[PDB]
Design an enzyme around this catalytic site. Structure first.
Site, mmCIF file in Angstrom:
data_model
loop_
_atom_site.group_PDB
_atom_site.id
_atom_site.type_symbol
_atom_site.label_atom_id
_atom_site.label_comp_id
_atom_site.label_asym_id
_atom_site.label_seq_id
_atom_site.Cartn_x
_atom_site.Cartn_y
_atom_site.Cartn_z
ATOM 1 N N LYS A 57 67.038 10.045 77.255
ATOM 2 C CA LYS A 57 66.925 10.264 75.805
ATOM 3 C C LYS A 57 68.199 10.323 75.133
ATOM 4 O O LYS A 57 68.275 10.053 74.185
ATOM 5 C CB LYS A 57 66.288 11.651 75.945
ATOM 6 C CG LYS A 57 64.803 11.687 76.211
ATOM 7 C CD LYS A 57 64.202 13.192 76.457
ATOM 8 C CE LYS A 57 64.750 13.789 77.688
ATOM 9 N NZ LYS A 57 64.187 13.103 78.786
ATOM 10 N N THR A 58 69.265 10.677 75.977
ATOM 11 C CA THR A 58 70.793 11.003 75.405
ATOM 12 C C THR A 58 71.302 9.531 75.099
ATOM 13 O O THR A 58 71.978 9.461 74.062
ATOM 14 C CB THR A 58 71.494 11.762 76.515
ATOM 15 O OG1 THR A 58 72.659 12.096 75.406
ATOM 16 C CG2 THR A 58 71.952 10.847 77.336
ATOM 17 N N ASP A 94 72.014 17.888 72.526
ATOM 18 C CA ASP A 94 71.503 17.421 73.660
ATOM 19 C C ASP A 94 71.288 18.249 74.841
ATOM 20 O O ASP A 94 72.146 19.494 74.682
ATOM 21 C CB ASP A 94 71.759 16.326 74.362
ATOM 22 C CG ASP A 94 73.300 16.407 75.021
ATOM 23 O OD1 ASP A 94 74.065 17.073 74.141
ATOM 24 O OD2 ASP A 94 73.640 15.815 76.048
ATOM 25 N N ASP A 95 70.127 18.532 75.572
ATOM 26 C CA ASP A 95 69.975 19.488 76.518
ATOM 27 C C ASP A 95 69.653 21.004 76.002
ATOM 28 O O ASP A 95 70.434 21.835 76.220
ATOM 29 C CB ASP A 95 71.107 19.642 77.662
ATOM 30 C CG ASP A 95 70.445 18.948 79.019
ATOM 31 O OD1 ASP A 95 69.287 18.899 79.012
ATOM 32 O OD2 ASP A 95 71.186 18.579 79.980
ATOM 33 N N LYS A 145 68.322 24.948 58.929
ATOM 34 C CA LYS A 145 67.713 24.707 57.604
ATOM 35 C C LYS A 145 68.630 25.166 56.385
ATOM 36 O O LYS A 145 68.382 25.632 55.669
ATOM 37 C CB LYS A 145 66.468 25.583 57.461
ATOM 38 C CG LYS A 145 66.541 26.986 57.341
ATOM 39 C CD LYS A 145 65.099 27.671 56.996
ATOM 40 C CE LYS A 145 65.113 29.148 57.311
ATOM 41 N NZ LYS A 145 64.019 29.849 56.664
ATOM 42 N N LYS A 156 66.624 5.615 85.339
ATOM 43 C CA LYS A 156 67.865 6.384 85.946
ATOM 44 C C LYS A 156 67.478 6.661 87.539
ATOM 45 O O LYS A 156 68.057 6.023 88.406
ATOM 46 C CB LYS A 156 68.010 7.846 85.497
ATOM 47 C CG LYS A 156 69.604 8.481 85.890
ATOM 48 C CD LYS A 156 69.694 9.647 85.235
ATOM 49 C CE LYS A 156 70.956 10.478 85.626
ATOM 50 N NZ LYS A 156 70.714 11.733 85.269
HETATM 51 N N1 LIG Z 1 66.603 1.220 78.065
HETATM 52 C C1 LIG Z 1 67.446 2.395 78.131
HETATM 53 N N2 LIG Z 1 67.300 3.374 77.706
HETATM 54 C C2 LIG Z 1 67.964 4.543 78.025
HETATM 55 N N3 LIG Z 1 68.727 4.508 79.208
HETATM 56 C C3 LIG Z 1 69.223 3.122 79.807
HETATM 57 C C4 LIG Z 1 68.365 1.943 79.342
HETATM 58 N N4 LIG Z 1 68.629 1.067 80.127
HETATM 59 C C5 LIG Z 1 69.700 1.299 81.077
HETATM 60 N N5 LIG Z 1 69.866 2.924 80.552
HETATM 61 C C6 LIG Z 1 70.790 3.777 81.529
HETATM 62 O O1 LIG Z 1 70.064 4.751 81.954
HETATM 63 C C7 LIG Z 1 70.834 6.024 81.969
HETATM 64 C C8 LIG Z 1 69.851 7.036 80.999
HETATM 65 O O2 LIG Z 1 70.010 8.207 81.772
HETATM 66 P P1 LIG Z 1 70.340 9.389 80.766
HETATM 67 O O3 LIG Z 1 71.415 10.224 80.927
HETATM 68 O O4 LIG Z 1 70.161 8.950 79.183
HETATM 69 O O5 LIG Z 1 68.930 10.179 81.079
HETATM 70 P P2 LIG Z 1 68.236 11.487 80.346
HETATM 71 O O6 LIG Z 1 66.849 11.378 80.497
HETATM 72 O O7 LIG Z 1 68.895 12.300 79.281
HETATM 73 O O8 LIG Z 1 68.515 12.734 81.877
HETATM 74 P P3 LIG Z 1 68.149 13.989 82.259
HETATM 75 O O9 LIG Z 1 66.589 14.417 81.842
HETATM 76 O O10 LIG Z 1 68.252 13.966 83.819
HETATM 77 O O11 LIG Z 1 69.071 14.804 81.902
HETATM 78 C C9 LIG Z 1 71.974 5.798 81.350
HETATM 79 O O12 LIG Z 1 73.082 5.137 82.446
HETATM 80 C C10 LIG Z 1 71.849 4.485 80.366
HETATM 81 O O13 LIG Z 1 72.794 3.644 80.319
HETATM 82 N N1 LIG Z 2 56.045 26.386 41.620
HETATM 83 C C1 LIG Z 2 57.077 26.302 42.582
HETATM 84 N N2 LIG Z 2 57.076 27.493 43.390
HETATM 85 C C2 LIG Z 2 57.926 27.493 44.392
HETATM 86 N N3 LIG Z 2 58.984 26.505 44.809
HETATM 87 C C3 LIG Z 2 58.875 25.201 43.865
HETATM 88 C C4 LIG Z 2 58.033 25.320 42.777
HETATM 89 N N4 LIG Z 2 58.092 23.803 42.395
HETATM 90 C C5 LIG Z 2 59.084 23.341 43.006
HETATM 91 N N5 LIG Z 2 59.457 24.270 44.015
HETATM 92 C C6 LIG Z 2 60.573 24.071 44.868
HETATM 93 O O1 LIG Z 2 60.091 23.953 46.055
HETATM 94 C C7 LIG Z 2 61.042 24.727 47.072
HETATM 95 C C8 LIG Z 2 60.425 25.887 47.425
HETATM 96 O O2 LIG Z 2 60.911 25.991 48.923
HETATM 97 P P1 LIG Z 2 61.344 27.617 49.445
HETATM 98 O O3 LIG Z 2 62.755 27.663 50.125
HETATM 99 O O4 LIG Z 2 61.150 28.568 48.257
HETATM 100 O O5 LIG Z 2 60.172 27.835 50.665
HETATM 101 P P2 LIG Z 2 59.798 28.988 51.566
HETATM 102 O O6 LIG Z 2 58.507 29.400 51.516
HETATM 103 O O7 LIG Z 2 60.854 30.121 51.311
HETATM 104 O O8 LIG Z 2 60.014 28.195 52.964
HETATM 105 P P3 LIG Z 2 60.282 28.545 54.460
HETATM 106 O O9 LIG Z 2 59.842 30.010 54.734
HETATM 107 O O10 LIG Z 2 59.456 27.479 55.259
HETATM 108 O O11 LIG Z 2 61.723 28.351 54.670
HETATM 109 C C9 LIG Z 2 62.218 24.794 46.141
HETATM 110 O O12 LIG Z 2 63.027 23.541 46.235
HETATM 111 C C10 LIG Z 2 61.689 25.038 45.063
HETATM 112 O O13 LIG Z 2 62.669 24.448 43.917
#
Ligand SMILES: Nc1ncnc2c1ncn2[C@@H]1O[C@H](COP(=O)(O)OP(=O)(O)OP(=O)(O)O)[C@@H](O)[C@H]1O
Ligand SMILES: Nc1ncnc2c1ncn2[C@@H]1O[C@H](COP(=O)(O)OP(=O)(O)OP(=O)(O)O)[C@@H](O)[C@H]1O
Ligand SMILES: Nc1ncnc2c1ncn2[C@@H]1O[C@H](COP(=O)(O)OP(=O)(O)OP(=O)(O)O)[C@@H](O)[C@H]1O
Ligand SMILES: Nc1ncnc2c1ncn2[C@@H]1O[C@H](COP(=O)(O)OP(=O)(O)O)[C@@H](O)[C@H]1O
Lengths: 16, 513, 526
Positions: B322-323, B376-377, B404, B481
Site C-alpha cells: 500500500k505505501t 501511512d500506518d 477538513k 512482500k
Molecule cells: N506491484 C507492486 N505493488 C506494490 N509493491 C510492490 C509491487 N511490486 C513490487 N513491490 C514491492 O513490494 C514491497 C511492498 O511492501 P510495502 O512496504 O509497500 O507493504 P505494506 O502493505 O505497506 O506493508 P505492511 O502491511 O506489512 O506494513 C516493496 O518492496 C515494493 O517495492
Molecule cells: N442553502 C445553503 N445552505 C447552506 N449551505 C449552502 C447553501 N447553498 C450553498 N451552501 C454551501 O454549502 C456549504 C455548506 O457546508 P457547511 O460547512 O455549512 O456544512 P456542515 O453541515 O456544517 O458540515 P459538516 O458538519 O459535515 O462538516 C458551504 O459551502 C455553503 O456555502
C-alpha cells in the site's frame, strides 16, 4: 520555580 | 582587483572605494570625512589582506598596528597613557600643517579584546574621547576587524566614530574560481601542472569552502605529489633524479579532497527513495486501476475551483503493498511540494510531540500553491491495541480537525492515507471524513502468481512446469512482500530441495478470504 | 477636561479630583487644623488603548510634581535570590532621602506601575503551597505602608484583571480609590475626533464637506488609538493621491495642493485600513460562507425567519437579556453557513466566532482559557453575538468508551447561564450534529430553543438545486428529471457539490452516467 543558588567568586589583584 | 590576490570581493571593494576615498580624491575646491571602518565575517575570508592592501594603496605614512591587548599594564595610568601615544603625530600635523596634512591610518586587530572593570572601562572611555572629543580631527582613519561582532560595545558604532561597517562572506562559484586561478597561476606559468586537471570541476566540487581551505587543498595536492620523490623508514631522501620532473595530476587533487580537507558544514539526508525498494511490477489489472484512480484524483485536485481540498484512503490486507503505490502516485503527481509522514521518525514520543510534528508538516504544506501529503500506518500513528482497546484520543481529534481545514485562499492540497484495518476506523467515525476509498487486493489465482514469478525470474522452465502443474488448478491468497520473503527463504537450500521447500511453505501459508 | 488632551471621561476625572485631590489644593492652614492625611494611591482598570497612561501623566503634571518613575511589572522579576526585592526597593530611595533632609517642606514624587497584577497575587495560606513571588508582594506591602512614614509620595497602578490582586493591597490605607475606563460613546468619540483634528483645522488642510459628526456615527466600537490611527491613515492616503495627481499630469501645483483637502480618504481608510478589536470582522464570513446561500426550498426561509425573530427578541427585551439557540441536523446539512448568515444579518456592533480549527493540539485548560477570554471580551459591549461551532469537536468525543473532556463541558454549562453586567445584552448560537449525545449529557435543557436543518428529500428540489447551480444542460436535465422524478431522495448540499465536481472530471460523453451511478451509490432514506 527555584531561585538560583548562591555562588562563589574569584578575585584579581593590581599593582601601583 | 585580482592583482592584490583576493577573489570574490570585487563588489565589496567597489563599495569601499565609493564610500571611503571619494571625498579625498574629489577636487578640493568643490569639497570646500570618514574616520572609522569595521570589517567582520567568519575566519579565513581575507580581512587581513584587505587591511594590508588598503594600507599599501594610499600614498601615506606607514600604518600603525597594535597586536591584540598589548595596552593593558599592571600599573595605574599606563593603559590609558598607551593610547595617547598613538595620536601624538596626528595632533602635531593637524596643528602645524592644518588642512594640508597627510592621512593617518590606525589598524586594530582583535579589537573585541579591549572594547566590550576599572582598566577596561577607562581604556574604552579614553579611546572614545580621543577618536571623537572636543578637538575634531579630519585626517585620521581607524580600521578594526572582528570575528564576533556581537561582543563589541554599542557606543563605538555610532556615527562619527565607526561609520563604514562591512561583512565578508563565503565566496560563490565565480569567487572560488578566481581564488583557484590565483593559487594555480604560479604552477601553470612554470608548466609544473599536469594537463588532465580541470579547474572548473574543482570549483564545482568545493562547496561551502573558504579561501583558506581552498589554499590548503592546493597545498595538500602539492604535498601528495612531492612525497612520490621522498624516501623514509631508514633515512629522509629527496630523490632529485625524478623530483626535478614533478607534475601534479588529478588523482592527487582528488585524494587531497577526500581526506586532508573537509567542508566543515552539515549534510542532508534523504529518505523518500527508501519507500520504494523493489519497484512496481505489473502482475495484473488492479495496479493499473489504482494508478488510473490516482491520476483522476490528482487531476480533480489540480483543476477544481470550489473543492480545493481532497482526501483519499487506501485499503488492503497486510503485506499487500500500500505505501509503495501511494508513494508512486505522489511521485507521478508532479507537485512542487511533496512529503511523507511516517511513524518511523517518531519512536518513544508522547502525544504532544506527535501532534506538534504533524502540525509542523501541515504548516509547511500550507505555504505552497499546490501540495500533496501522504500519511501511512494510521493505526500505528494513533497507537491502537485490540485489548481494552486502548489508543490516543488527542491524535485522533487532531487528525479529524486537520482532515477538513482548507488552505488559505487560492491554494490546493491533496491528502492520501493508508491503513490495513478499516473496521476500526469505521468504528472511530473517521471513515466519513475521507471523500473516497480505494481497495488494494492480494493475488487471487495461480495465473497471476505464475506471471509474477515470470517477472521476478527466480525459477527456470523445468521447475515452473511442475509449479504450474501444482498451483494452476486452485485459488490462492498471498501478498507480494511475503511472496518475496518465501522465495528468499526457499533459495537457501541446495538446488535439489528448492522446489519442494517452496511448495511446502506455500501450502503452509495457503488460506482463503 | 478636554483642554488637556483627554476627551470622553469628564465624570471619572471629576470624581477622582473630589475623592483624592481636594486636600492638595485647599489652603494649608485649615488642612493642618483638621489633622487629615492625604490619599496614598489609586487604581485604574479597563480595556487596553483607552487612555490610562495619558491620564496618569496628566495628573502628574497637574500638581507640579517631579518627573514620574515608570515601571513595567513583568520586567522586575529576576532568577537570582534577593534581586527582584532590590529592584522593588530601589524606587523609594529618593523620596526617603528628600523627606529626611527637608521634613515637611519637600516636593511630591510619583510612581507608576504598569501591569501591576503580574507581580501581586494572592498569597498562599496553606503550608507548602506558597506562591513563587510571595516575597515580592511582602516587600511591596512593607514599603507602601510601614513603621517609618512617608508623606510625599503617590502610587498609581494600572491593570486589566482587577480580580487577581491581593486584598491586603487594596485596604483603605493602600490604594483605596478605584476607577474604570471603558469604551467611549458617540459623544466621547466626537470629542476625541475634535481633539485630534485641531492641527489640520488650524493649518487649513480640511475640506468644506468633512463632517466629523457622520464619522463619529460611523465608528461604533473604536478606542482612542483606533481613531488616531484612522486620522493618520487618512492623511497618508491624501498625500498618496497628491503624489498620483502630480506625477500623472502637468497640472499646475496649486490645484494639486487644493486637492490636499480630504473627504474620500476617510471612507477609504475606514474600510481597508482599520480593524477594531471589539468590532465585527468581514474576513471570517468568506471562510465560513464560501459558496453563498441558494434557495432550493422553503425550509431555508423558515430557518432565516426564526433567526430574525430571535434577534428581534434579544434586541428589545428587558426581562430576558440573555438568549440561546441550538441548530441541529444530519451531517453535511449546512448548519455552519446558516448560523454565520444569521449572525451577519443581525447588524450588532460585536460579532465573534469560536471554532476548534484554532485550537489544534491544545489541552483542555488552554481551550477553557480561550473560550473565557472570548466571553470576557463580549461582556464589554452593549449588544453582542457569539457563535460556538462543532460542540462535539470541542469536547473530544469518541463513541468507543465513550471518552470526552469534562472540564470543557462544565465550563460550557456554567457559561450558558451567566448574564452580562446590568443593561448589556448577548445572543449565543451553537451548531451540532449529534443531539442524542447532548441529551444524554443533560446539556439540551441549558438552551432556550432548537431549530432543525433538514436534507434534500424530493426530486424537484434536487432539480431546482441543479438549476440554481447551473451545471447540466437541457438534454441532460431532461434525462435526469425523467430518471429521478420519484421523490425518494436523501442528500446534502455539500455532498451534492462534491458529487458534481467529481462527475465533471470524466469525458464529455460519460458524465451523466457517472453522476447517476454516484447518486445511486449514495443513501436514499433516513
Ligand atoms: N506491484 C507492486 N505493488 C506494490 N509493491 C510492490 C509491487 N511490486 C513490487 N513491490 C514491492 O513490494 C514491497 C511492498 O511492501 P510495502 O512496504 O509497500 O507493504 P505494506 O502493505 O505497506 O506493508 P505492511 O502491511 O506489512 O506494513 C516493496 O518492496 C515494493 O517495492
Ligand atoms: N442553502 C445553503 N445552505 C447552506 N449551505 C449552502 C447553501 N447553498 C450553498 N451552501 C454551501 O454549502 C456549504 C455548506 O457546508 P457547511 O460547512 O455549512 O456544512 P456542515 O453541515 O456544517 O458540515 P459538516 O458538519 O459535515 O462538516 C458551504 O459551502 C455553503 O456555502
Ligand atoms: N578570499 C580570499 N582570496 C584569496 N586568498 C584568500 C582568501 N581568503 C583567504 N585566503 C588565504 O588565506 C590567507 C589569508 O588569511 P587572512 O589572514 O587574510 O584571514 P582573516 O579573515 O583575516 O583571518 P582571521 O579572522 O582568522 O584572523 C592567505 O593564505 C590567503 O591566501
Ligand atoms: N481619551 C483619549 N483621548 C485622546 N487620545 C487618546 C485617548 N485615549 C487614548 N488616546 C491615544 O492613544 C494612545 C495610546 O493610549 P494609551 O494611553 O497608551 O492606552 P492605555 O490606557 O492602554 O495605556 C495615546 O498616544 C493617545 O493619544
Amino acid at each position: 520555580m527555584a531561585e538560583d543558588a548562591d555562588m562563589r567568586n574569584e578575585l584579581e589583584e593590581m599593582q601601583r | 582587483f585580482e592583482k592584490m590576490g583576493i577573489g570574490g570581493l570585487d563588489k565589496e571593494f567597489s563599495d569601499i572605494f565609493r564610500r571611503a576615498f571619494a571625498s579625498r580624491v574629489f577636487p578640493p575646491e568643490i569639497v570646500e570625512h570618514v574616520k572609522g571602518i569595521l570589517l567582520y565575517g567568519p575566519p579565513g575570508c581575507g580581512k587581513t589582506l584587505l587591511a594590508r592592501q588598503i594600507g599599501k594603496m594610499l600614498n601615506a605614512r606607514e600604518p600603525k598596528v597594535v597586536n591584540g591587548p598589548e595596552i593593558l599594564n599592571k600599573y595605574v595610568g599606563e593603559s590609558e597613557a598607551n593610547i595617547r601615544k598613538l595620536f601624538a603625530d596626528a595632533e602635531e600635523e593637524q596643528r602645524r600643517l592644518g588642512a594640508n596634512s597627510g592621512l593617518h591610518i590606525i589598524i586594530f586587530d582583535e579589537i573585541d579584546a579591549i572594547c566590550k572593570t576599572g582598566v577596561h572601562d577607562t581604556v574604552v572611555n579614553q579611546l572614545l574621547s580621543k577618536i571623537d572629543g572636543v578637538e575634531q580631527l579630519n585626517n585620521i582613519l581607524v580600521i578594526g576587524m572582528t570575528n564576533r561582532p556581537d561582543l563589541i560595545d554599542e557606543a563605538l558604532l555610532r556615527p562619527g566614530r565607526l561609520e563604514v561597517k562591512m561583512e565578508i562572506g563565503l565566496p560563490d562559484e565565480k569567487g572560488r574560481l578566481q581564488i583557484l586561478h590565483i593559487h594555480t597561476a604560479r604552477m601553470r606559468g612554470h608548466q609544473l601542472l599536469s594537463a588532465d586537471v580541470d579547474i572548473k570541476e574543482l570549483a564545482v566540487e568545493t562547496k561551502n569552502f573558504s579561501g583558506a581551505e581552498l589554499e590548503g587543498l592546493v597545498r595538500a595536492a602539492q604535498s601528495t605529489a612531492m612525497n612520490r620523490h621522498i624516501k623514509a623508514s631508514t633515512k629522509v631522501e629527496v630523490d632529485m633524479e625524478k623530483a626535478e620532473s614533478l607534475q601534479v595530476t588529478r588523482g592527487d587533487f582528488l585524494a587531497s579532497l577526500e581526506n586532508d580537507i573537509k567542508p566543515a558544514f552539515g549534510t542532508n539526508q534523504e529518505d523518500y527513495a527508501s519507500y520504494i525498494m523493489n519497484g512496481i511490477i505489473k502482475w495484473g489489472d488492479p495496479v493499473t486501476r489504482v494508478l488510473d484512480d490516482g491520476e483522476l484524483l490528482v487531476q480533480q485536485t489540480k483543476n477544481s475551483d470550489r473543492t480545493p481540498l481532497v482526501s483519499v484512503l487506501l485499503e488492503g490486507p497486510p503485506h499487500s503493498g500500500k505505501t509503495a503505490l501511494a508513494a508512486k502516485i505522489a511521485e507521478e503527481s508532479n507537485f512542487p511540494f511533496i512529503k511523507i509522514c511516517s511513524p518511523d521518525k517518531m519512536i518513544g514520543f508522547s502525544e504532544t510531540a506527535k501532534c506538534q510534528a504533524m502540525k509542523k508538516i501541515f504548516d509547511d504544506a500550507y505555504k505552497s500553491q499546490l501540495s500533496c501529503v501522504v500519511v501511512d500506518d494510521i493505526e500505528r500513528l494513533l497507537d491502537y491495541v485490540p485489548i481494552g482497546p486502548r489508543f490516543s484520543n488527542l491524535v485522533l481529534q487532531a487528525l479529524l480537525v486537520l482532515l477538513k481545514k482548507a488552505p488559505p485562499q487560492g491554494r490546493k492540497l491533496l491528502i492520501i492515507g493508508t491503513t490495513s484495518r478499516k473496521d476500526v476506523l469505521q468504528e472511530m467515525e473517521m471513515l466519513n471524513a475521507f471523500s473516497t476509498t480505494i481497495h488494494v487486493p492480494n493475488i487471487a489465482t495461480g495465473e497471476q502468481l505464475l506471471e509474477a514469478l515470470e517477472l521476478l525470474g527466480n525459477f527456470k522452465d523445468k521447475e515452473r512446469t511442475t509449479i504450474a502443474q501444482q498451483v494452476k488448478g486452485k485459488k490462492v491468497w498471498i501478498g507480494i512482500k511475503k511472496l518475496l520473503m518465501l522465495i528468499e527463504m526457499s533459495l537457501q537450500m541446495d538446488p535439489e530441495y528448492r522446489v519442494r521447500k517452496f511448495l511446502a511453505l506455500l501450502r503452509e501459508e495457503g488460506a482463503s478470504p
